Symmetry: C3
Subunit: 147 residues, 3 copies
């Protein structure tokens, strides 16, 4: 009957089926391109992964990728002589956190005016571009892009 057809269609308009609704928890497949403005009042969750390791010389790099941006924080303490303009060779940054282009991450040494930077190239073999140093507490928080 026409009533039976309408009833089933009405159901789809309310919830379920293959239509996205203005209410309800829903899972949505397909590439969705929004051409206007999108606002999210709740949380926005993207794929995330974290890693932390000692790059070299006592310097620790802690990373968290959210989509295609990596959050970094530099930690640790210089506990052996790190030579000027040298490769940090204890651990490389894993491939999933390596950028397409070399990024230069600026940091600061606790208690004075001294700054350094560490490069992360696409290989993940990071490089120290301060001078030769054998002590101190390096710090710095920021982001770099993966893409």
């Amino acid at each position: 009957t026409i009533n039976d057809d309408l009833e089933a269609i009405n159901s789809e308009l309310t919830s379920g089926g293959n239509v996205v609704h203005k209410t309800g928890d829903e899972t949505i497949a397909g590439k969705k391109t929004f051409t206007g403005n999108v606002e999210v009042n709740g949380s926005l969750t993207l794929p995330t992964k974290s890693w932390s390791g000692e790059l070299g010389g006592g310097i620790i790099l802690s990373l968290r990728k959210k989509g295609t941006t990596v959050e970094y924080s530099i930690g640790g303490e210089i506990s052996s002589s790190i030579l000027a303009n040298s490769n940090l060779v204890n651990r490389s940054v894993p491939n999933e956190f390596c950028p397409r282009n070399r990024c230069s991450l600026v940091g600061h040494m606790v208690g004075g005016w001294n700054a350094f930077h560490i490069d992360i190239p696409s290989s993940g073999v990071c490089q120290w571009f301060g001078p030769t140093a054998s002590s101190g507490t390096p710090r710095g928080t920021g982001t770099y892009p993966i893409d």
Copy 2:
């Protein structure tokens, strides 16, 4: 009439009702999980809040949270002796802007080669990790995560 039933259904499928459409400004409740890729051509807007305050010693920290990322801008002008490795005790960063993990925000002093950093711990009691300084113009723009 059956035709009126059918036409009212069609109306819902083209605007309004509980259906999300490919045109029109719409408000959408429920947890929506996109299992594929999403592209936004307009703006993407997340919950946003701003705060600025004098942490201590003439240093002003200006913050704007967008979702779970905080944009920071270090400003002001040193107006008293800010001691090396010191708590900034004029104003704490409000809880809403305090990170889960202590972040180190690298800055630079106008007119020379001098860098510092300011830590924002989970408590919001910020700390200056330059050396003792009683003058200068501190600056630096970046981000840190809340989560």
Copy 3:
């Protein structure tokens, strides 16, 4: 009849196409969409992107990529002539599209020692050097600033 003509159209749009967003399919969606709840994206989330690179002045190169209203920067090049403290960098301005509403200070570091500087991008895009007067060295630094 008219009934089946109507039901054809309705059934069609309930499955794909039409002006309905579906739980499958590659679709383009116009209008401001406000999600009052939580949103998760399991794939990629892509925003409008544009890139620009130019020599600001004195050999210093700024490479920029805007993703939405955030600009990714990387400082490059090499100081190859005298740049005075507090001076405008007048070889190239940052294009309007990448200029911030609020002045940003981009901290950098000079290769091989402990020296830091910063470069401001004012709303005008006429960048300013806030290191000391300098005529040599390799400036670097990667970060972000907001346009809005």
